[PDB]
């Protein structure tokens, strides 16, 4: 357990990938990656599936990435005295505005409103530096895929989701 998760955004597209037991989950168009204890990632997957299913049923609308970000932050602040051993990462695109969105969290729920890329988990600093040296803004979806896959390969087995507004491509390395 503890595989590293990396999220990256281009123009009107975001890409989230993890080391490879799946560690990236989706609740519509919002993708949540959770690095940490296996039990805690499983528990968070179940809990957020429950919460987002109820949200969709009550709203008749899929939860948007920023609303999901606030949801996960407030759900992680619960257990403030018993925090989960997880650094989550959320990626997605707003259905209405189309703005790509990526965010990272600490184990208690502080949100890192990153604009370009996010990493979390073991060997965080190494892959962070590699992304900083390798990332470029506003990349095309295929260029974004190449960049994120290269970043992972420099840190096998891996899964990367290339997310548009309307279609998602899931790839295994």
């Amino acid at each position: 357990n503890g595989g590293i998760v990396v999220a990256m955004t281009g123009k009107d597209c975001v890409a989230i990938a993890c080391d490879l037991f799946e560690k990236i989950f989706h609740y519509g168009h919002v993708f949540l990656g959770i690095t940490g204890l296996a039990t805690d990632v499983t528990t968070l997957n179940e809990m957020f599936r429950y919460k987002t299913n109820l949200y969709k049923l009550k709203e008749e609308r899929a939860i948007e990435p920023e609303t999901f970000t606030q949801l996960v932050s407030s759900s992680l602040y619960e257990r403030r005295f018993g925090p989960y051993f997880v650094g989550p990462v959320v990626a997605g695109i707003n259905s209405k505005s189309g703005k790509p969105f990526i965010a990272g969290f600490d184990l208690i729920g502080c949100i890192d409103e990153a604009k370009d890329f996010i990493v979390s988990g073991t060997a965080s600093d190494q892959l962070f530096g590699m992304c900083e040296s390798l990332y470029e803004p506003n990349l095309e979806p295929e260029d974004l895929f190449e960049t994120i896959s290269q970043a992972l390969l420099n840190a096998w087995g891996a899964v990367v989701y290339i997310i548009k507004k309307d279609e998602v491509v899931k790839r295994y390395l």
Binding site: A38, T39, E46
Partner: protein, 191 residues
């Protein structure tokens, strides 16, 4: 020592566990039948683990009686994981490892799940706990293949126990073996 072994093969799941070791005993434990086509092998801390296993058996039997329908091994494994996490919420984690082997009989496939002491479950082709881990994996990683028949799985398990009885400095006590098939749970004679 407490060791539990499990191998998932083409048509069966072979679950094996070492006999209980206690002063001056003669006579199975480390296994509870949750339903006609799934049984739960467990190991770890004495008292706590068996008390948890009996409670899980009670819940699964209650579900079976309630619906007159058998809970799938996937659902059983999920429930066991959820209950183990619930139990560990309030108290110090107790060393426990659980192998839920069963035949789903709806997808008509044999599936095996291991649940660690922290309540994390992983679907496995094979598994082990305790002193068996290091040595058996060195062999299973080479000999195991999913197409092997149940008899071949028993042969592989016999080889694994033959290897352990040599690695263990103690004169090993042997292991009981139980097989779950489309025909239900069964116990072997020669082990």
């Amino acid at each position: 020592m407490d060791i539990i072994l499990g191998i998932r093969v083409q048509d069966s799941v072979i679950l094996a566990s070492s006999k209980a070791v206690t002063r001056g005993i003669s006579v199975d434990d480390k296994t509870r039948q949750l339903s006609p086509h799934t049984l739960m092998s467990f190991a770890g801390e004495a008292g706590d683990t068996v008390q948890f296993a009996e409670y899980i058996q009670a819940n699964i039997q209650l579900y079976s009686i309630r619906e007159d329908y058998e809970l799938s091994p996937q659902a059983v494994s999920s429930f066991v994981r959820q209950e183990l996490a619930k139990s560990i919420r309030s108290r110090r984690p107790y060393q426990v490892n659980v192998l839920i082997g069963g035949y789903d009989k709806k997808k008509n496939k044999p599936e095996l799940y291991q649940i660690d002491y922290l309540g994390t479950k992983v679907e496995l082709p094979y598994g082990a706990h305790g002193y068996s881990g290091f040595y058996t994996f060195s062999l299973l990683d080479h000999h195991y293949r999913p197409d092997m028949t149940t008899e071949e799985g028993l042969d592989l398990l016999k080889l694994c126990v033959q290897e352990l009885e040599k690695r263990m400095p103690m004169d090993f006590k042997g292991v009981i073996v139980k097989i779950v098939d489309k025909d239900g749970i069964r116990q072997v004679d020669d082990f």
